[PDB]
Every structure is written in C-alpha cells, then in structure tokens.
Amino acid sequence: SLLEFGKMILEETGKLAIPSYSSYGCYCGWGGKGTPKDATDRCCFVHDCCYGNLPDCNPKSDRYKYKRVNGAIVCEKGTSCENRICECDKAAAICFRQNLNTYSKKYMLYPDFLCKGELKC
Ligand SMILES: CS(=O)(=O)Nc1ccc([N+](=O)[O-])cc1Oc1ccccc1
C-alpha cells in the first residue's frame, strides 16, 4: 500500500515520503510524462512502470508484509499481487537510497508543464 511504501521510504532514506518523494520531478507521486529529471525521478519512473506491469493489482491500497534481514528488505509471501507490489516498492526504496547523493530539493513540487513527451517503459 502507499502508506507502507512511505514507511519503507522513510526507513531507507530518512526522508518523509510526503513531502520528499510525493511531488518530485516528473514521475514521483504523480506520473506520467516527460523525461525524468534525475536519477531519483528515474526511480519513480521505473516504479510507475513496475506498477503498470500489474494492471489487475491495486498497489495504492493492497497491503503486503516484509521483514529486514540485516538491513535487507525481504518481501514475505502474500497474494501474487502483494508479492509483486512489494518487489516494486522494495526496488524503488533501494533506488532512492542509491540516489540520495543527487537528490535535489529544486525538484520538489516540480510543475507539470515542464514534463512533456512519452517515454516508454
Ligand atoms: C497521488 S495519488 O492520488 O495517491 N495517486 C498516485 C500515487 C502515486 C503516483 N506516482 O506517480 O508515484 C501517482 C499517482 O497518481 C497518478 C497516477 C497516474 C497518473 C497520474 C497520477
């Protein structure tokens, strides 16, 4: 679920999902057009694609379980949708951590009109 993803993001990064990742660049918190602005935004692009892989799942609301094994995220077995959603979220959280070095506050509340053009998953 979105709330679980937000907790995972905070755990990974030390940033609150709202506001740090809820309105960032062209793809975080809202897709779905434009060239991603930076690596963090590309995490969101890929995460959006990852959810897009799951048209019959409901990633905003469906809850999954996960644990930590020495810092590592391990998605625990739920329904097929839950497992796949968890894997999408895990990847994005790791991606955000891997790109914290280049996170730029200037991309918070990035305006829509600067995000133009289709980029295929
Ligand atoms: C913000 S919301 O109402 O909870 N919906 C939603 C949540 C996350 C994302 N996103 O891009 O990560 C995008 C979201 O919304 C959109 C999905 C597709 C296209 C436009 C917006």
Q: How was this structure determined?
A: X-ray
Closest CA to 121 of 70, 47, 56: 47
At what resolution in Å was this solved? 1.1
Domains of the chain with bracketed CATH: 1-121 (1.20.90.10)
Q: 4 is written with which tokens?
A: 């679980």
Concatenating the DSSP letter of every residue in 10-75 gives: HHHHSS-HHHHTSSBTTTSSS---S--SSHHHHHHHHHHHHHHT-TTS-TTT----EEEETTEEEE
Assess contact for 110 and 24: CB atoms under 8 A.
Answer: yes
State the pairing for strand pair 66-69/72-75: antiparallel
Nearest CA to ligand 1 atom 12: 29
Feature table: binding site for Ca(2+): 27, 29, 31, 48
As annotated, the active-site residues are 47, 89
Q: How far is CA 85 from the centre of its chain?
A: 11
Feature table: binding site: 27, 29, 31, 48
Cα distance between residue 109 and residue 20, in whole Å: 9
Pocket of ligand 1 (CB under 6 A): 2, 27-32, 44, 48, 60
Compute the distance from residue 6 Cα to the ligand 1 centre, in Å: 13
